[PDB]
Each structure stands twice: as C-alpha cells, then as structure tokens.
C-alpha cells in the first residue's frame, strides 16, 4: 500500500497534466451591455438576462 519505486518524472507529469485540467465555460455576449457572459446565466455586469432585470448590481 506504499509506492514501491519513485515514479519517473514522465509519469508524474503525465498524470498531473491530465488531471489538473479545467475546462473553459461557454460564453455568449449579453444582448444589453455587450459583455461576454456565461451562456445561460444572468449577466454579472448589467443584471439583464433575455432583456429582463433580475439583479441590482452594486459596488
């Protein structure tokens, strides 16, 4: 239940690069402000979404 021999840097690198990989979220520019917002989410910069106000963005 313990490593038998230290793995090679190739194997460590391979595992690390494959696992520690985060995927980009999709985007779609807001119809109101033109910001690039996450697709299917309320715009975080102007608050609109499909031409409807839902937030009141502060500071």
Partner RNA sequence: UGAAAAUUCUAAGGCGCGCGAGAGAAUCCACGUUAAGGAACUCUGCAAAAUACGUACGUAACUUCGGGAUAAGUACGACCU
Partner RNA sequence: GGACGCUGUCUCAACGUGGAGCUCGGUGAAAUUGAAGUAUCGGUGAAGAUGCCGAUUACUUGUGGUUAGACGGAAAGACCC
Partner RNA sequence: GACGGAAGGGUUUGGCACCUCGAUGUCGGCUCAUCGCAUCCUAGGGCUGGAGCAGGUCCUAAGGGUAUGGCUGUUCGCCAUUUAAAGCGGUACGCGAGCUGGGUUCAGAACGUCGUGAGACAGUUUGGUCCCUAUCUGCCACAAGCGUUGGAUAUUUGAGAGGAGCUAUCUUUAGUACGAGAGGACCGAGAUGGACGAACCUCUAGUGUGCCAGUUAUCCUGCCAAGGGUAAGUGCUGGGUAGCUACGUUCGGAAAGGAUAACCGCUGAAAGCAUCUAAGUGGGAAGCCUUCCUCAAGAUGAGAUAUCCUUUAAGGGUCCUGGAAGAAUACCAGGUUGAUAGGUUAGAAGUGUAAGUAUAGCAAUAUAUUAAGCUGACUAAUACUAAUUACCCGUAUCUUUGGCCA
Q: How far is the CB of 38 from another protein (least distance, A)?
A: 6
Footprint (CB under 8 A) of another protein, residues 1-59:
38, 40-42, 44, 49, 54-55
Minimum CB distance to Zn ion smaller for 33 or for 38: 33
Cβ(46)–Cβ(37) under 8 Å? no
> Is 35 a binder of RNA (CB under 7 A)?
no
Q: How far is the CB of 13 from RNA (least distance, A)?
A: 9
Residue 21's alpha-carbon distances to 14, 16, 57, in angstroms, are: 11, 8, 32
Determine the distance from the C-alpha atom of residue 3 to the mean position of all C-alpha atoms in its chain, rounded to a whole number: 34
């Amino acid at each position: 239940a313990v490593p038998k021999f230290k793995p090679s840097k190739s194997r460590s690198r391979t595992r690390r690069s494959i696992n520690m990989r985060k995927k980009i979220p999709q985007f779609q520019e807001c119809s109101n402000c033109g910001n690039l917002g996450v697709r299917h989410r309320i715009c975080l910069k102007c608050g609109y979404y499909r031409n409807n106000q839902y937030l009141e963005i502060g500071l």
